Each structure stands twice: as C-alpha cells, then as structure tokens.
Symmetry: C5
Subunit: 207 residues, 5 copies
Amino acid sequence: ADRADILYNIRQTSRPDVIPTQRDRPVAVSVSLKFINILEVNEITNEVDVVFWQRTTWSDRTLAWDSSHSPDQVSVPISSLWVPDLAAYNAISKPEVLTPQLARVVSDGEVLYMPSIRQRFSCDVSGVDTESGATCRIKIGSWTHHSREISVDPTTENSDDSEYFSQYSRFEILDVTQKKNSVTYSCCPEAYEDVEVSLNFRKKGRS
Amino acid sequence: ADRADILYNIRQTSRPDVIPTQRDRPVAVSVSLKFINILEVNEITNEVDVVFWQRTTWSDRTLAWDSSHSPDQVSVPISSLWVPDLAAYNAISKPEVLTPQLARVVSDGEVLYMPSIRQRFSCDVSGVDTESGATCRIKIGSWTHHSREISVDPTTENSDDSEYFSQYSRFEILDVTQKKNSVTYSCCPEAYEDVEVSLNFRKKGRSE
Amino acid sequence: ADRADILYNIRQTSRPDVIPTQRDRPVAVSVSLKFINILEVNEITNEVDVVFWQRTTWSDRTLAWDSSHSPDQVSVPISSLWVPDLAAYNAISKPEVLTPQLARVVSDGEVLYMPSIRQRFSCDVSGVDTESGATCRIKIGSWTHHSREISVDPTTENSDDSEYFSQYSRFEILDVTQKKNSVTYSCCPEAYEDVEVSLNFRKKGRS
Amino acid sequence: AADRADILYNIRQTSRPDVIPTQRDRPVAVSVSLKFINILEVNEITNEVDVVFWQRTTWSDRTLAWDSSHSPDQVSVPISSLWVPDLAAYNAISKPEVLTPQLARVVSDGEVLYMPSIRQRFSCDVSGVDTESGATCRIKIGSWTHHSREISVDPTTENSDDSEYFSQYSRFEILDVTQKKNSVTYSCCPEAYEDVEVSLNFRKKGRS
Amino acid sequence: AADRADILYNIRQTSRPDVIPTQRDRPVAVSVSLKFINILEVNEITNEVDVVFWQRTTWSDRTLAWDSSHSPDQVSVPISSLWVPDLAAYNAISKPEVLTPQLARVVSDGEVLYMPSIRQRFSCDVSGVDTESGATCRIKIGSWTHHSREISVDPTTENSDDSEYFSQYSRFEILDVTQKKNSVTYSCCPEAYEDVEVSLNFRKKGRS
Ligand SMILES: CN/C(=N\[N+](=O)[O-])NCc1cnc(Cl)s1
Ligand SMILES: CN/C(=N\[N+](=O)[O-])NCc1cnc(Cl)s1
Ligand SMILES: CN/C(=N\[N+](=O)[O-])NCc1cnc(Cl)s1
Ligand SMILES: CN/C(=N\[N+](=O)[O-])NCc1cnc(Cl)s1
Ligand SMILES: CN/C(=N\[N+](=O)[O-])NCc1cnc(Cl)s1
C-alpha cells in the first residue's frame, strides 16, 4: 500500500456529514488553543482580536488502515472528513482560517486538525493596562451536538503558555487555563459541553 | 439503523428546493431572535451592527423516520434540507453566519436551525444615549414565499430578554418584544408575513 | 402534479446559459428600482452608497406547465434559471445581494426576480444639502445582449417613490423618474438598451 | 437554421477551457484595450490609485466557428465554458473586482470578445496629480504564465478620444492615454513575456 | 505526437491533487523563494506590515511527465488539477490574497513551477523602519501539515538581487533580503517542520 491507496480508502469509508460514533458512545474531541498573537484590543468595547492555533483531536475508526508496510500518517482535506461542529460562543466575527485546510490522519483513525485562526471575541478587557492584566475568557463547544453525541475536553498539558506567542505583539501572556464546562440552555434539558480558555494578558511596558 | 442510514435516507427523501407544504396549506415557520451583542451603534446614520441567535423551527414531514430502534435526532447540513428563505427587510448587510451551518432534525419531522448571525441594520437609533433608550425594529420573514406558503409566528415567551446577552457589551437591553405582522405591496396581490423584533436598549453607565 | 414535479421539470427544461428568445423578437425584460435606503454620500468624490430592490421581470415560455390542477407559482433558485445579465454602467462596486437568491416562476413562463442590492455608484451629488437636492442618475441595462436580443423597459407603476424607503435614513427622496434609454458605442453598431433612473434626493436638514 | 442553444452546445463540446487554442505552433493573438471609466481614492503620498476600466480583450478560437447564414451571428457565453487569456496587471495591489457579468461574446467566425468592467488598485506614479501637467500612472498587463511563443498581447490602435467613456462626475480628468507594447523578460529564465503598458495621464479638476 | 489538449488530458488522468508525489519515500524537495514587489502599509506601534511579493514555488511531480520530443515541453495548468505544497506563512495575520491567475507551469520532465503574486499582512519587527539602518521583518514560510520526511523546503540559493521587481513608486526601499533555511519542532510531537525564513531589511525613503 501507498499514500494514493490510503486517500482512496478514506474516500470510500469517510462520511463527512455523519458523526463517527463508535457504537452509542460520544465522540471525544480534545480541544486546545495555542495563542500566537493579540492584534487589536479595545478597553471600552471589551473586544479582542486574536490569532491562535486550535489543536483539535478526535477518533474515527472507519478511516483506519494497516500501516505495516505503508505510511501511518497522511494529510487529508477537511472536506473529505467529518469534522466537529465547534463554535466559539462569544465570537463576534467569522473565524478567519489562515492555514491550509488539511487534517492529519493516523493509521489508527485518530484525526488531528489545527488551523491557525484569526477571530474577534467579546470578553473582559478590563485590567489590560494594569500589571495583573485582563482575563479574556473564550468558550468553545459543539454548536449542535450534546453530551451523549459529542464530548469536549482540553489537552490538560501544563507547559509554556507563550511558547509560540509573537514577541512583536503589543501584549504579553501571563497565564492560560483551559477548563471543562457543561453549559445548558433554557428551552430543553440538553447539556452542551464546552472548553473555557481563560486568557490572562496585559499590555507591554511597566511602571 | 444508525445515523449514517438516517442521513442517507434523508438525502433520498429531502428536496432542498421544494417547500414541504402540507397538501395545500402554509408551512409554519417559527422565528425567535436571542440577542448576544451590540457592536457598533451610530445615532447619526441610524445604523447598528448586531449579533443574535436566530432560532428557527419548522416541520418537514418528508424527513421523518422510525426512531423506535434508532436515534431520535441528527445534525444535518442545511444544504441537504429545505430551509425557509428568511430575510431581514431592513438589513444593510448580508447575514454573516458565524456558527457551523447545521440544522437539528428529529424523527418526528421537526427541524431546528439556530445559527449565530452578525448583521447590520437600518433602524431607529435615536435615544441610545438616554434613559428610555432607542428602539431598533428588525422585520424578518420569507423573501419569496407569501402567506399561503410560509406563515411566520414569533415563539413569544416573556421570560428573559438578556439571558444570553453578553455582560461585557457597552449596551444593555431594556426590552425586547416580538410581534407578528403581514406586508402587502401596491404592485401585487400576495401578502408576506413577518416578525417585527423591537430591540429597546441603551448605553450602560450614564449620568443620573 | 405537486410542487416537487413542477420544480423537477423546471430543472430538467431550464437552460441557464441560453437566452429564451422568442423567434427573431428580443426578450422583453422589465426593470424597476424601488429605493429602500441611501447610506453613504460624498459630494467631493461624487459617490453614493445605496440600497434598492431591483424588481426584474421577463418571460421564458419553455418552463410553462398546466396550473389548472397544480400550484401556479413556485420559488426557484436563480442558478437554475436563465437570468438577464444586467449591469449598472456607472457602478463602482460589485452589487452586494442581501436577500436569498430565489426567483418566482409563474406557470405561463413569467419570471420575477427582485433582489435587495446594496451598491456604490458614481453620480451627481452636487446639491444634497440644498432645497433643490441632488439628482443621482443610474443606468442599468444588459452587458452583452443588445436591443435585438434583450430589450429593457421601466415598469411605469405609479407609486410614491418613498413607499419602501427607510424613514430612519439620514436622507430623503424628492422624486424618482425611471426613463428608458439605449446606449451605443464607437466600436460597433450594436445598441444596448438601459433604464436611466433619476434619483432626486437631499439630506433631512431637521428642525 | 441553428438556434442559440445549438450554437452554445457546439461551443461547449469543442471548447477546451483549460487549453490554449494554439493554431499549429503560432501564438494566440490576444488584443487588450483599456477604456477608463473612473479614477477613485488617489494618494500622492503612498502612490496608489483605484481605477475603474473596461478591459476589452479579443482573441480567436477558430474551432468554435459556425455558419451564420441563417442563424445568429453571435452568442453570449459564460467564460467558464471558454478558454480566457490569463491576463494580470503586474503592478496591481488588489485582486481585480469584476463588477460586470462574466459573459464573453462568441462570434461565428471563431472570434471571442470579453470586456468586463474592473475596479482595481495600482502602485504607480501619482506625483503631479494636482498640477496642470498631471501625473502619469503606468499599468502593465499581460499573460501571467504564457510566453511570447504562446501568447502575444497587442494594444488596439483606435486613436479615439481618451476620456470617451470616462465619468464626468470624477474628481479627476484624463489628459492623454497611450497604449504601448512591451516585452518583459526575467533574470532567471529565457522565454520572454509580452505585455501592454498603458500610461494614464490624469489630473485633479481645478475646482476654483 | 501530441497536442497541448492531449498533454492536459493525461495530466488530469495521472494527477491526484490530494496526494503528495513522494518518489520512493524521499521527501518532496519544494523550493521556495520570495521576490518583493511592494510594501504598502507599515505600522511601527503594532508591528504589522502589508507586503506584496511573488512566491516562486518549485517542485517535482514525476506522475505528470510525458514525451516532448515531438510535442510542446511545457504547459500552463490550473493548480486545482495538480498537487500543490500546503505552504503557509507562520506569522501571517491575514489570508494570502492571491492577485494573479491560479495556474502553475508544468514541464515535460515533471517539474512544476507556481509563482503567484500575493498580498499579505504579517506580524514582524517593524522597529527602526524610519531609521537609516531600517527594520528587519522576518517572514517564516513552510509546509503546514507535512514534516521534514515528507516536505523539505529550501531557499533557492540563487540570487537574483533583489529590489529588481520592487516598485520604485513605494514609500519604502529594500536594503537587503536574505533567505536562510530552518527546522522548527514542537512540544506535542517529535517531528520537525522545515521552513524558509525571509529577512526583509527595509526603511522609509525620506530625503538626504
Ligand atoms: C505549527 N504546529 C504544529 N504542530 N504542533 O504540534 O504544534 N504543526 C503541525 C501540524 C499542523 N497541522 C496539523 Cl493537522 S499537524
Ligand atoms: C445555544 N442554544 C442552543 N440550543 N438551544 O436549544 O438553546 N444550542 C444548540 C443548538 C444550536 N443550533 C441548533 Cl440547530 S441546536
Ligand atoms: C418582499 N417584497 C416583495 N415584493 N414586493 O413588491 O415588495 N416580495 C415579492 C417577491 C420578491 N422576490 C420575488 Cl422573486 S417575488
Ligand atoms: C460597455 N461596452 C461595451 N461594448 N463596447 O464596445 O464598448 N459593451 C458591450 C459588450 C460587453 N461585453 C462584451 Cl463581450 S460586448
Ligand atoms: C513575473 N515573473 C515571472 N517568472 N519569473 O520567473 O520571474 N513570470 C512568469 C511566470 C509566472 N508564473 C509562472 Cl508559473 S511563470
């Protein structure tokens, strides 16, 4: 087997419009943003324009193959794959995807998709010019699928919060915490899971 | 059966360009805006930029299936279903759809589609910097289907207007009231139903 | 024959890239702008930004069906139909179509398409703050089909011109005249028919 | 008698959109003539100008020819069904906003005419715009991928008025226009690339 | 023998655009080189530049080759028919605005050449732009999803020097472009993604 065959096989088995629920359990999607830049910020309107990599991780076993004597990874367009309907609940602009819309697929079915996204949010900018900084909280979860259908978690890998953050930003990152949360709506007993990324940041220059 | 089979079936039955009209009566489409944010008001131009979750419900019986031994619900792309051709009559920009464009379909035939839309309107902004606030009126209904094909009725419930409104907005919501109406034109015989949403709001933290 | 059948047959019989020309005679397209709003205006650059419903009407007899025991009108996507190739000759922006891209098809062959269009034009803005107002003239006609192939005609539909105009606009309409015309060029004899729409308007100098 | 439908279907089945209609080995003779409709948002500091123009573009594909003895002489055809020359403005700094329907005109002798109204920004000499001598903005346009052996671009010597189709309502006026032919070559590679250099000479209307 | 239409037909039959053309299990040697055309907006406070550049991209796809001994040895081909490297600018803050026809140039041996003019905004060091020694804006471009065992990027150590196609009408000027190679790795996984780093040394002209 070879890469042509892997991609060919994916076309035959993949159903992009059908959630790949193994049996009757939810598809566990691991979500994790890595902040790259903070471009525009508004102290009055409480809005921030941000650039970030949204590391996304789920499993789809229909796409699996034997990588005994063939590659165990390929890049595949997201248009050929089911992708989770993640939305940011406090975004006030369409997510601007800056990178090639290709997911990485492993022989064992586990998918990895990490687009760099510029997007504008509505969050608490208060304190941004102080030295304890502002805390902008972003809530990201499935727009249409609930607990039983999709579950969302953070990678919970504590490390360098400003590893890939631009040194040429006007701001700097103090902390980033990523917390699981089980939001529910007033219409219906239907709990939607979301990951709450708290971005603690301040403007550079101090006195 | 499974979710794969349900969607397969739905593709075969559903006709996206065919309004699923029950014999010879209008399709009942309910509409309900839930305002999330108010971004850029301009009292001079009488223009406001708004974010809202447009909760839309209707029945397409042709989508139905037996859910005894199968899931009762699935998310389906809006391109695989018929969707009401709703437009805001006083919009001055295309609706920017922020969320994934999937609808929610139940085996009983009812569709639920609630996108988060950002849009700019022309409406009465005067009074935004006052106690009583400005009242922005947004009229929404079918662009091509008249009252015999689409009837719109606002799912009105005096519960909580700012339930999902952002606390960090410059503005605060005083009141929202959704009201059914019906527009006719001196050109033509057809009447087009609509929902007027009166958004009464003002700036937070004014002098008293 | 239910709605599905009408619509099905329309898709089977429609020829989007072929003008439904009756014999030698042209296609009688009728066009009528109904001004909804005027948003931005500049007297220095002579540039207006205008919203208007472009009521467009023509006949394609191939689509006709017997509507004695059937629906007599249906809503159809304009990507399925032939559509007159209209252009605003003094436009300076691609027309932003704000409404759903659906036309109305009648069983006798008549097609009605009335999109709401926001568009930027180049025209006389001199006046505008005065009592007389300013007359912005807008020419709309076919881009590639001349008199013999496409004819344009304003629908002389007596209506006060502010019927659908926004009361919350910063400007107001004085008078709107929709005059038929026919522009011709220096390369070729080909004469192209246009509607010359005269928008006499001014700023609401309040009191 | 062949009707328009028959003419189109012939074109579709024999026109190869992604194949240059080379006649044996000789280059396809494209003709490019810009007609200027307006000049907008000028800037002498940054050296940049929005310009609207009709880009009259003519070439020929004789495989498309038919007998118009008792049938229409021309048809309008979408450009997606045709091969269209891959012209680009070399000093453009925004992608071209095509304002008009993307229909070409095919003539029964195989001749093809495409003339869109394009609104596009350029980097060029804007110095002198508020002087009587004016500024001279040069726009180079030619095939992005096909060399002289494959595509030749010719400026149409018409000798007409330069401000013929130009908007009288612009802030600026045209003094003179000259469409010269040029042969751009690159440091890396041998094969030469033809272009038309259009020198637009324009000045700000003396409002006094 | 074979015409251009025959060459193009064969390409669409052999070319699989979503499959990296790894000969053996070597990485694909994608070579990347920017050639700067303009610098339009610069902001020293926010560290953001709006640059226009040609992105000379070159690689081998041997599943495209053909016998050109009695046929043309090159063709222009739309990139949607070819596999194209998934190159991204790591510190780009806007999508790449491709200003030119999206056609690549394929040679009979399998060599593909794609040189799009692109306008794009970057987050980089603008400090000193108005000084004599200027600013140094570093742009990092490499594959987005393929690691070093799949795509290897490399600057064509071929100058070409190097304000050659840079607009003389720009507000700024180039002092030095240098294009060295790099190999970034991450904390997630042990696989290195090659990139090219283009240091643009520029400054506002002024006078002296
Ligand atoms: C830039 N950071 C990356 N990985 N990382 O672990 O941070 N890039 C590799 C990938 C990019 N897209 C997919 Cl899918 S994997
Ligand atoms: C935020 N409110 C939601 N549901 N709710 O019932 O309130 N979201 C779930 C869905 C959103 N769109 C569709 Cl369709 S289901
Ligand atoms: C909403 N206003 C309408 N007419 N009007 O005269 O105002 N609708 C009728 C139609 C609109 N578009 C098509 Cl097609 S039929
Ligand atoms: C706007 N000027 C035109 N002709 N002219 O000669 O000036 N229009 C007619 C055509 C437009 N596109 C094609 Cl093809 S023929
Ligand atoms: C403007 N520079 C060019 N080449 N160059 O090597 O400098 N143009 C020719 C090409 C443009 N796109 C392809 Cl592919 S070949």
